[PDB]
Amino acid sequence: NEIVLFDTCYMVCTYIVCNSPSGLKKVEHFFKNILPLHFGLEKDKFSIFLDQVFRGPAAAIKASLKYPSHPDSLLEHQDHAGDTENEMHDDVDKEQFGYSSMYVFFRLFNLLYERLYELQRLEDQVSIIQQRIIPNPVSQKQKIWRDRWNDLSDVPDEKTHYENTYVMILRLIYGIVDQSAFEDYLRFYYGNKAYKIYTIDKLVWSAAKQVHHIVSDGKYKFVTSLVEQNLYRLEIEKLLNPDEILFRFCWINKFKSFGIKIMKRANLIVDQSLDTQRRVWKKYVQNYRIQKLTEEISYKNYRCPFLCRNIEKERTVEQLVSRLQTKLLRSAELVSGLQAKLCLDSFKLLYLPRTEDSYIDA
Amino acid sequence: SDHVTPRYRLPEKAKVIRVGLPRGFKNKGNIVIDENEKPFKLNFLEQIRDNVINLRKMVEQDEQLCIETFSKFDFYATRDCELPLRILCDVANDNLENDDYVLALRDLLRISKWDPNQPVPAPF
């Protein structure tokens, strides 16, 4: 739903520009360069839709508070056009790498999107509840009927109930109408079925806090530069952070899908019983984890034992493993392995004299 | 296993005895305590790729067989509600009809009188 997506982005940027004058240039930079890199939205048209409120019409927009006008469809794609039955192939158009501070932001963005979407989907329940609350002629004749419309404040007049509720959300965000009036509007129109919008203010505040942290945290310029500079696995698992997790973000355009995967997680704290644990646990992981990054303790020295220029340059690191698999399914005589079962000393890696390894490749 | 053992009580000076009788030890089911008595370095995805292709092949064969047996699964499982109606209306004795009549007799709790008829036992 492009409408709901633009509304979510507009809400976060509006909250930032209203409640936080500081860091305004940096938040423009973020919302204008980093987020489109992950969402594949159209650059210039997203720019127009955002500076529709980012630069003037704070008191002017505070007074006006109109519904943000939406442009036409926003779609960006590379040289991949065409779709047929039985071959509706897909591709990870944009693949980025990130950390916890951005993972939380995407999760909050998704929460906000889901709740605005569910809010839009109650248009028929609006009329059902309005029919439910209807005066009784006997009560009117007995002079005991107190209408409920005379309690609402100035209600906006847009085309859609969703737009009216959106203007009300913006009013709460800016700080005009209080929580009581907002909840009373929600109860008059949506009954007791819109109970998830009540904490939309806290949700937007958390999203803006994560945006500010992303853009101005301890390694802010470093991570933003290593993101915006432009095949990045050993170009992304080198830096150090306070025990974070590495994430892979993928965007598919033919389906409008967004995928979050967990890559290697940074190492935990070392222990003293590892000397006795290695006898059973360590070798199990190190051997059964065939060609996969073992993660017990690795921070100290990881001088990459091969230059990155030797590997053939390629995009979409997911297919590098396919290249390796195709290579492995080739002329290699490929004797099994060294068969080095010695840990009785538990201080070093030892081998057996026989059990060489043959022509590993070809 | 303590959910289905008959409860018992051990004294608080109970040396755990190790019974040497290899077979045939009557033990009251519950008082038997813990029954006390290569590194390859493969590093290949060859077997993983082969296993993935094998799984896809098994899946392909299964799907092929099932999707051919469609158009008969439909006829024999979706019209299965009207053939019972046939063998009920035109009362033809099959095993399930007679089991349903046993069900109705067990509901009515007959004793020694004659069974009325196939369509006139009356929990109607």
Partner: peptide
């Protein structure tokens, strides 16, 4: 047949994630 094989492959491409 080949149609069912194409269906299985397309399902795999569509739900490989």
């Amino acid at each position: 047949e080949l149609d069912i094989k194409a269906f299985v492959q397309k399902l795999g491409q569509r739900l490989c994630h």
